[PDB]
């Protein structure tokens, strides 16, 4: 399990063309000699990686490698229930994933990384771990995917990807009404909340009772 | 858009539970479709990235159920016959202008055949480098998902061992692009850590070549050292393991001490001119990691308990014998006569009996090139030794094609037709000995049973001549019009004692010979196909016959910690002066703070190792050089300031050295380890610090009080 962690750290560091490198070097020195994952503050395992995607001044290629590594991290399923604070780890991963930004570059295209982010969001949402997230971050995820789908300026195939991903997310949202009983018992509900409190969020990614 | 809709729907079908109920043919078509989408660059970049992403999920879903499926067969002897190029990628189709059963195991072999065809050396011209990197990463993910289960399935083991690793060695040798080198090195490191134990021999050729390129472009060496580094970090005690398995052994070449000496030569700052600046730090990290791991091993055992190892364990003793074992080679090879007397003189074979020397030929695979062995077996009068050697082979239920494949891997035949006749008679005798008698068992219509046919010794002689001549005639590329079934059958109508053969044996033999070569050792006087011939001779010993091991875990679990501490004497008695010289060289050359502190701590740990192991020369040399480094060895004196005191205080390099030196002095237990040079150095140190009013003299006040001075 740890072998993937040091291999990805080595690959990203030598991709960095030898401040953010200090975190990865600290991660490597922490796990240079540690057989099997132990009490390690598993949020701290991922914490150097989310600094790459969260920061706005990083190049497109580096954040693309970061997103690919994160997708590998989820796919091999190393952050399990045994690893303590895994709920916070996945929460931080999604929260940093929503606010991903970058600077344009000739290497690759923005559409590639901006599709990797959406696929990683999908694989997080339909996974069982998606049950354990919060309403604020998942509403932010929905705002991000709505902004991706609505924006006609982006590539059309990316828009189709966003639409299909949103359909899958809608399945995973509305399927959970079955497992939860209605609030109250036959109370005389009187509507008072507004019909326009929530509004569409403008795009921010790309080139430039909540917390329960 | 519609293409990505197709890919999304395919993914949603595959990872769904209902996707378990698919079939091999259609799912292989799905894999071909997605691979043609991903590899082909005609489509947009974003769609290609989508295909790249979904293929990882599809591969993970396919390879997950290797855990679910139990092993097939009864772990019998798997003689590989199927080719390495039956499957191949098809061009893209979508866009503008044991198969039909439940889906399961055998699609994965076709899948890995497709990936090997992606990354194969011969197919380099067809495919591009991006799809090559994609294939390398796909094999990495597929292996490291369920690597430990792949040892059970030998049909997968042959495919993942011989051709794929041959391709990996080719990319490590010939290619020059940084990213492709990175991908293949990542796959190689994954292979070593996960399937290190059962993939014994190819790692040694790989490491010999990797240090060959390393020792003699500057940019590639940085990547080469970077990706190979984690083997000494993320593994068990890697140097001890690769010495326990290999360098102790006699047949295999050196890997461990070669690794240490390569790191020694490469770790000096003089390598900074020939190689970039990122290599010496991680090289030093590996060198420090060796002593760190040994010091971790060192804590539990005391001084006296290690001294009770009376036997001087046999493996190290044969390791001292290895430097004469290598001298035995190139004396048997040059002269089959006059060498075997020298072998039995050195006692490396327990006696000059035919059985014992035959067992010696059987055991050794690497040294003693096999053309000379075949020439020895073709003597005018050595038939007893030849018969005993051939009898040692096992053919319990093996086919004659599989049997001759097993034979031919171990020695090339003599040249002329008269000479070749000597081997087949003993082969036929052994084959008749290796199968039971068949009174009223044979039947033409029966099939799928090797036990059905019991061919005559003259008949298997005829069939051996036929199959070897067929291999010689068919596989020459320049020669044309190879014989076929209608003519192959017509030659051998009636062989089994005035009785006809069955068509089952003949058509399966023909299919097997059509499928793949009969591997034999080969050597050319010049370069020519140097690497391919070398790989063929190296893999001829191992990959042709395989068996499932019970103790799949390495031998280190069996050995006690005392046994490991006894074993590492071979490490330190060979490497100690070199590593100490390297450490002291960069220690005096370097100027940084934390690096120097790390050097001093590592050097103190090496001193502790030398103190334990009674390395008197090394333990004197380290401490004498430390004394030289104290800057107290060869204006007016006047809180006593002095020239010696000021030189002491100005330099951190001398500052740190003295306290660790006296720490080493206080920590000692045995006094006989010390020698006159160290004693003279410490008393000169004591006198020098007495001279400058800096060490107070009254340090036995009790005696002064007793005597009343």
Q: What is the DSSP string of chain A?
A: -HHHHHHHHHHHHHHT---HHHHHHHHHHHSTT--S--S--HHHHHHHHHHHHH-TTSBHHHHHHHHHHHHHHHHHT-S-SSSTTHHHHHHHHHHHHHT-EEB--SSS-HHHHHHHHHHHHHHHHSSGGGGGS-HHHHHHHHHHHHHHHH-TTS-HHHHHHHHHHHHHHHHHHHGGGSSSPPSSSS------S-SSSS-PPPP-SEE-----
**Per the CB < 8 Å rule, is A76 touching B145?**
yes
Of the candidates B632, B619, B631, the one whose C-alpha atom is nearest the C-alpha of residue B664 is B619
Three-state DSSP at B543 gives coil
In this structure, is the dihedral angle defined by the CA atoms of residues B523, B528, B533 and B534, taken in order, positive or negative?
positive
Residue B216's Cβ-count burial label (10 Å; 0-12, 13-18, 19+) is exposed
Resolution for this experimental structure (Å): 3.9
Three-state DSSP at B568 gives coil
A18 touches chain B (CB under 8 A): yes
Q: Are B298 and B609 in contact (CB under 8 A)?
A: yes
Which one of B138, B194, B227, B234 makes the best mutation probe of the A interface by having the most chain A beta carbons within 10 Å? B234
Q: Are A210 and A135 in contact (CB under 8 A)?
A: yes
What are the Cα distances from residue B356, in Å, to A90, B317, B489, B572? 65, 21, 42, 35
Of the candidates B434, B432, B443, the one whose C-alpha atom is nearest the C-alpha of residue B499 is B443
Instruction: For the beta carbon of residue B524, count every other beta carbon within 10 angstroms.
Output: 9
Q: What is the DSSP string of B57-92?
A: HHHHHHHHTTTTSPPPTTS--B---S-S-S--PPPP
Three-state DSSP at B111 gives helix
Strand duo A101-102 + A206-207: pairing: parallel
Nearest residue of A to residue B146, measured between CA atoms: A76
**Per the CB < 8 Å rule, is A108 touching B186?**
no
Structure tokens at B682: 């410490």
Rounded CA separation B205/B192 (Å): 13
**Per the CB < 8 Å rule, is A157 touching B4?**
yes
User: Which residue do the tokens 């053969």 mark?
Assistant: B501
Q: Are B41 and B130 in contact (CB under 8 A)?
A: yes
Structure tokens at B4: 């990505």
| Backbone breaks in chain B after residues (C–N over 2.5 Å) | 97, 216, 634, 638
Rounded CA separation B697/A96 (Å): 66
Structure tokens at B214: 């390393």
**Per the CB < 8 Å rule, is B145 touching A119?**
no
Nearest residue of A to residue B43, measured between CA atoms: A157
Rounded CA separation B213/B355 (Å): 43
Q: Are B622 and B605 in contact (CB under 8 A)?
A: no
Three-state DSSP at B475 gives coil
The H helix count followed by the E strand count for chain B is 34, 0
**Of A32, A116, A157, Cβ closest to residue B53:** A116
User: Which residue do the tokens 């209902």 mark?
Assistant: B18
Rounded CA separation B538/B543 (Å): 9
Residues 6+ apart with CB under 8 A from B339: B328, B331, B332
**Of A10, A108, A115, Cβ closest to residue B227:** A10
First-residue to last-residue Cα distance in chain B = 103
Residues 6+ apart with CB under 8 A from B521: B369, B370, B371, B409, B411, B412, B536, B537, B540
What are the Cα distances from residue B309, in Å, to A18, B303, B306? 48, 12, 6
Rounded CA separation B3/B44 (Å): 11
State the method. Answer: cryo-EM
Q: Are B612 and B294 in contact (CB under 8 A)?
A: no
- Chain A contacts of B12, Cβ < 8 Å? 168
Which one of A67, A114, A160 makes the best mutation probe of the B interface by having the most chain B beta carbons within 10 Å? A160
Q: Are B117 and B87 in contact (CB under 8 A)?
A: yes
Buried b (16+ CB within 10 A) or exposed e, B613-649: bebeebbbbbbbbbbebbbbeeeeeeeeebebbeebe
User: Which residue do the tokens 């083991």 mark?
Assistant: B157
Provide the CA A124 distance to its chain's centre, in angstroms: 7
User: Which residue do the tokens 């490396």 mark?
Assistant: B348
User: Which residue do the tokens 């890697």 mark?
Assistant: B238
Three-state DSSP at B494 gives coil
A3 touches chain B (CB under 8 A): yes
**Of A14, A109, A119, Cβ closest to residue B226:** A14
**Of B49, B60, B222, Cβ closest to residue A115:** B49
Structure tokens at B29: 């078509």
Residues 6+ apart with CB under 8 A from B502: B444, B447, B452, B453
Rounded CA separation B51/B44 (Å): 11
Structure tokens at B129: 């480098």
Q: Are B139 and B190 in contact (CB under 8 A)?
A: no
In this structure, is the dihedral angle defined by the CA atoms of residues B612, B617, B620 and B622, taken in order, positive or negative?
negative
In this structure, is the dihedral angle defined by the CA atoms of residues B553, B555, B559 and B564, taken in order, positive or negative?
negative
Rounded CA separation A16/A51 (Å): 14
Structure tokens at B526: 């010049």
> Which DSSP helix (H) or strand (E) runs through B36?
helix B24-39
Nearest chain B CA: its distance from A157 CA (Å): 5
DSSP classification of residue B18: G
Of the candidates B126, B222, B124, the one whose C-alpha atom is nearest the C-alpha of residue B181 is B222
**Per CB distance under 8 Å, which residues of B are interface residues toward A?**
1, 3-5, 8, 12, 44-47, 49-50, 53, 56-57, 60, 141, 144-145, 182, 186, 189-190, 193, 222-223, 226-227, 229-230, 233-234, 278, 292
**B78 DSSP β-pair partners:** B546
**Per the CB < 8 Å rule, is B227 touching A33?**
no
Nearest chain B CA: its distance from A190 CA (Å): 42
Q: Are B634 and B693 in contact (CB under 8 A)?
A: no
- Chain B contacts of A33, Cβ < 8 Å? 233, 292
> Which DSSP helix (H) or strand (E) runs through B369?
none
In this structure, is the dihedral angle defined by the CA atoms of residues A122, A123, A127 and A130, taken in order, positive or negative?
negative
What are the Cα distances from residue B512, in Å, to B402, B416, B505, B506? 9, 26, 11, 10
Of the candidates B197, B205, B181, B171, the one whose C-alpha atom is nearest the C-alpha of residue B537 is B205
Q: Give the number of C-alpha atoms closer than 13 A to the C-alpha of residue A24, restricted to the C-beta side.
A: 21
Q: Give the number of C-alpha atoms closer than 13 A to the C-alpha of residue B240, restricted to the C-beta side.
A: 25
User: Which residue do the tokens 């997103």 mark?
Assistant: A67
Nearest chain A CA: its distance from B49 CA (Å): 6
What is the greatest pairwise CA distance in chain B?
119
Count how many pairs of residues, chain A against chain B, have C-beta atoms within 8 Å.
Answer: 79
Q: What is the DSSP string of B248-309?
A: SSSSSPP-HHHHHHHHHHHHSTTHHHHS-TTHHHHHHHHHHHHHHHHHHHTSS--HHHHTT-
Residues 6+ apart with CB under 8 A from B20: B65, B103
Altogether, the residues listed in chain A come to a count of 212
> Which DSSP helix (H) or strand (E) runs through B209?
helix B202-215
Nearest chain B CA: its distance from A168 CA (Å): 10
Rounded CA separation B611/B671 (Å): 10
First-residue to last-residue Cα distance in chain A = 31
Q: What is the DSSP string of B619-655?
A: HHHHHHHHHHHTT-----------HHHHHHHH-HHHH
Instruction: For the beta carbon of residue B177, count every other beta carbon within 10 angstroms.
Output: 13
Three-state DSSP at B123 gives helix
DSSP classification of residue B492: T
Q: Are B612 and B298 in contact (CB under 8 A)?
A: yes
Instruction: For the beta carbon of residue B477, count every other beta carbon within 10 angstroms.
Output: 5
What are the Cα distances from residue A181, in Å, to A64, A176, A177, A178, B206? 42, 10, 8, 8, 62
DSSP classification of residue B412: P
Three-state DSSP at B334 gives coil
Three-state DSSP at B546 gives strand
Q: Are B230 and B281 in contact (CB under 8 A)?
A: no
**Per the CB < 8 Å rule, is A72 touching B141?**
yes
- Chain B contacts of A115, Cβ < 8 Å? 46, 49-50, 53
Nearest chain A CA: its distance from B307 CA (Å): 30
Q: Are B648 and B632 in contact (CB under 8 A)?
A: yes
Of the candidates B418, B409, B615, B444, the one whose C-alpha atom is nearest the C-alpha of residue B522 is B409
Tell me the angle at which helices A135-150 and A156-174 cross, rounded to the nearest 10 degrees.
Answer: 150
């Amino acid at each position: 399990p740890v072998t993937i962690i040091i291999k990805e750290c080595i690959n990203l560091s030598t991709a960095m063309r030898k401040p953010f490198l200090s975190g990865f070097i600290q991660l490597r020195l922490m796990l240079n000699k540690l057989k099997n994952l132990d009490n390690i503050d598993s949020l701290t395992i991922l914490q150097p990686f989310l600094l790459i995607v969260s920061t706005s001044s990083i190049s497109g290629y580096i954040t693309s490698l970061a997103l690919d590594s994160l997708q590998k991290f989820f796919t091999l399923n190393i952050i399990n229930e045994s690893s303590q604070n895994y709920i916070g780890a996945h929460r931080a991963t999604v929260n940093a994933l929503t606010h991903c930004r970058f600077e344009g570059s000739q290497q690759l295209s923005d559409d590639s990384v901006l599709l990797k982010v959406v696929f990683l969001l999908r694989s997080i949402v339909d996974s069982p771990y998606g049950d354990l997230l919060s309403n604020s971050i998942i509403y932010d995820v929905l705002q991000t995917i709505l902004s991706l789908a609505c924006n006609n300026r982006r590539s059309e195939v990316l828009r189709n990807a966003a639409q299909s991903t949103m359909i899958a997310v809608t399945v995973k949202i509305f399927s959970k009404l079955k497992t939860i009983e209605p609030v109250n018992v036959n109370q005389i509900y009187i509507n008072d909340e507004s019909y326009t409190n929530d509004v569409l969020k403008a795009d921010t990614i790309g080139t430039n009772y909540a917390d329960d | 858009s519609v293409l990505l809709k197709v890919v999304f729907l395919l993914r949603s079908i595959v990872d769904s539970p209902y996707g378990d109920l698919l079939s091999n043919s259609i799912i292989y078509d799905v894999l071909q479709t997605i691979l043609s989408l991903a590899c082909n660059n005609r489509r947009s970049e974003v769609l290609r990235n989508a295909a790249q992403s979904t293929m990882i999920a599809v591969t993970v879903k396919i390879f997950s159920k290797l855990k679910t499926i139990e092993p097939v067969n009864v772990n019998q002897i798997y003689i590989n016959d199927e080719s390495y190029t039956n499957d191949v990628l098809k061009a893209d189709t979508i866009g503008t202008n044991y198969a039909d059963d439940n889906y399961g195991l055998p699609v994965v072999r076709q899948y890995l055949n497709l990936l090997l065809s992606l990354i194969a050396p011969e197919n380099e011209l067809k495919h591009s480098y991006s799809t090559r990197i994609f294939g390398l990463e796909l094999i990495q993910t597929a292996l490291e998902i369920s690597g430990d289960r792949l040892q059970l399935y030998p049909r997968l083991f042959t495919l993942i061992s011989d051709p794929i690793f041959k391709s990996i060695l080719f990319i490590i040798q010939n290619t020059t692009k940084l990213s492709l080198l990175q991908a293949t090195l990542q796959l190689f490191t994954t292979l070593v850590v996960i399937l290190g134990n059962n993939l014994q021999l190819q790692i040694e050729l790989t490491l010999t070549r990797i240090f060959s390129i390393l020792l003699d472009p500057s940019i590639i060496k940085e990547l080469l050292i970077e990706q190979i580094s984690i083997l000494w970090t993320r593994s068990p005690s890697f140097f001890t393991s690769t010495f326990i398995n290999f360098d102790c052994n006699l047949d295999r070449a050196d890997v461990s001490i070669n690794f240490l000496k390569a790191l020694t030569k490469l770790a000096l700052p003089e390598s900074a001119l020939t190689t970039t600046e990122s290599v010496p730090p991680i090289c030093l990290e590996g060198l420090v990691s060796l002593v760190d791991d040994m010091f971790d091993h060192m804590k539990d055992i005391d001084r006296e308990e290690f001294g009770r190892q009376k036997n001087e364990m046999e493996i190290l003793k044969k390791r001292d014998r290895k430097t004469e074992f290598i001298e035995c080679t190139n004396a048997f090879n040059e002269k089959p006569k006059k060498g075997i007397p020298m072998l039995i003189e050195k006692g490396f074979i327990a006696s000059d009996s035919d059985k014992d020397i035959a067992e010696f030929l059987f055991n050794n695979n690497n040294r003693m090139n096999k053309k000379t062995i075949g020439l020895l077996l073709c003597h005018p009068d050595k038939v007893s030794l030849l018969n005993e050697y051939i009898r040692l082979f096992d053919f319990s239920g093996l086919r004659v094609d599989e049997a001759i494949r097993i034979l031919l891997t171990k020695f090339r035949l003599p040249g002329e037709s008269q000479q070749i006749e000597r081997i087949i008679e003993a082969f036929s005798s052994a084959y008749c000995e290796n199968q039971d008698y068949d009174p009223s068992k044979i039947s033409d219509n029966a099939e799928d049973d090797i036990s059905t046919v019991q061919p005559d010794a003259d008949s298997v002689f005829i069939l051996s001549y036929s199959i070897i001549m067929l291999n010689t005639d068919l596989h020459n590329p320049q020669v044309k019009e190879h014989m076929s079934f209608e003519d192959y059958s017509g030659n051998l109508k009636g062989c089994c004692n005035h009785k006809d053969f069955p068509f089952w044996y003949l058509d399966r033999i023909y299919c097997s010979i059509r499928d793949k070569e009969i591997v034999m050792p080969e050597e050319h006087h010049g370069n020519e196909k140097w690497f391919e011939d070398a790989w063929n001779n190296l893999i001829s010993s191992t990959t042709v016959i395989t068996e499932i091991k019970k103790d799949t875990q390495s031998v280190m679990d069996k050995l006690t910690p005392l046994e490991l501490l006894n074993f590492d004497r071979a490490i330190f008695k060979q490497v100690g002066p070199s590593i100490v010289s390297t450490l002291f060289n960069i220690y005096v050359v370097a100027s940084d703070d934390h690096i120097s502190t790390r050097m001093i701590t590592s050097l103190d740990k090496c001193s502790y190792i030398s103190a334990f192991f009674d390395f008197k020369d090394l333990f004197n040399d380290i401490l004498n050089s430390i004394a030289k480094g104290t800057t107290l060895i060869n204006m007016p004196l006047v809180i006593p300031v002095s020239t010696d005191a000021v030189r002491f205080g100005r330099s951190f390099k001398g500052q740190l050295n003295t306290v660790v030196f006296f720490r080493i002095i206080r920590r000692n237990k045995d006094p006989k380890i010390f020698s006159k040079e160290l004693w003279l150095n410490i008393v000169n140190i004591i006198l020098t610090l007495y001279e400058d009013l800096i060490l107070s003299p009254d340090i036995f006040p009790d005696l002064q009080k007793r005597l009343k001075l």
